């Protein structure tokens, strides 16, 4: 009798993590929760006396 | 895109005076008693 780790393989309903700063992946439920709700604006400020940074 | 100076930040102008010297608070010499103080 065979299954999924015998032939080396991914089983029928399985996950492959979160995606990191320098992995890929899903996205954790919160990254949803935040992204659709998320807006443009950032504001801030821009340049004081002629110098940024 | 804002400018500040000492003024804007509370603060002393680099080109500044001060309050001259009373008998009551200090400060800066008087004309006045400068002149006198060189003539006595």
Do not use: C, R, W
């Not at chain 1, 032939?7 to 492959?16: C, L, Y």
């Not at chain 1, 979160?18 to 992946?25: E, M, R």
């Not at chain 1, 949803?32 to 940074?53: C, F, H, R, W």
Request: overall charge negative.
């Amino acid at each position: 009798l065979l299954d999924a780790e015998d032939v080396h393989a991914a089983k029928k309903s399985h996950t492959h993590e979160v995606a990191t700063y320098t992995t890929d992946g899903f996205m954790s439920s919160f990254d949803k929760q935040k992204i659709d709700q998320l807006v443009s604006p950032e504001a801030g400020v821009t340049s004081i006396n002629g110098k940024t940074g | 895109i804002v400018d500040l100076f000492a003024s804007d930040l509370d603060a002393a102008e680099i080109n500044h005076t001060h309050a001259e010297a009373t008998t009551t608070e200090s400060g800066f010499l008087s004309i006045d008693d400068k002149e006198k103080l060189d003539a006595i």
